[PDB]
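Budget justification note: compute hours in this period were largely spent on complex prediction jobs such as the one shown. Inputs:
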Amino acid sequence: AHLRAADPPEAIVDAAGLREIRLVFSEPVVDRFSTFRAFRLSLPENGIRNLTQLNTLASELGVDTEESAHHEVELESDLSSQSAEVTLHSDEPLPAGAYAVVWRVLSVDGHTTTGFHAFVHAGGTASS
Amino acid sequence: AHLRAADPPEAIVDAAGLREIRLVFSEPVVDRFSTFRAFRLSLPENGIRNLTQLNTLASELGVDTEESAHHEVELESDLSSQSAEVTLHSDEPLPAGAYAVVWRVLSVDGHTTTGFHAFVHAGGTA
Ligand SMILES: [Cu+2]
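Corresponding output:
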C-alpha cells in the first residue's frame, strides 16, 4: 500500500478549530493490525526553519513510541470507504503546534507498512 | 542600514506567551520618521510549505498598508541601545499564527529604507 492523500497536508495551515486528521491509503486497511497515533512535537529553542526539519523529527516516532516520553494527542480512529480511508478524531480541538501522525498499516495485500505525516498548525482551537 | 537580527527569528517557534518582537538594526534609527507595524497573515487554503512563501506574503505589506484590509497587531514601539534596537510590545499576548513585522526606517546617516521580517508562532498565549 501507500498513502494517497492526507488532510491537513504537509504544510503550515491555519485551520482554526482543527479536530480531525484524515488519511487515505491506496488499498483497504485491515482493522486490528493497523494502528494510528499522533503527537504534538517539541520544537527546539528558536524553532525550525523548514518542514524538512519537521519531517526529520517526525520520522523518529512510531506506533510503539512511549507516551510518557512525548506529548501524545488523544484520539479515536475509524475506518471508512471500504476501509481505505482513516479518520482520526481528536478529543478536543488541536491547539497551535507542530504535529506528526504515525502509523503501522496491514493492507489487504498482506504487507505491513509504517509511516508518518507531519504538519504545522498555525491556528489555534478557535478563530483569531 | 540593514536588519542585523530579530527575535523571534524567521522560523516556526513555539514561544507560548510571546508578546514582544525585538529588532536590531545596523545603525541608529530616528524616532518619529521610523515606524513599525505588525500583522497576523491569512494563509491560503492550501497552507504554505516553506518560509519563502511566507516571505512572499509579508513582502507585499508596508507602513502604508490599510488597517481595515488586514489583521493588524495593536502594539507600542520603544527605541534603545543608542536607538539601534527597537522593541515592539504587543498589547496582548500574540495568538498562534504567521506574522509579518514591516517598517520604514530613517537612519542617522539620513537614508530611508523599508523592510519586513516574518515568523510563525506555532504556540499559544500560555
Ligand atoms: Cu545609508
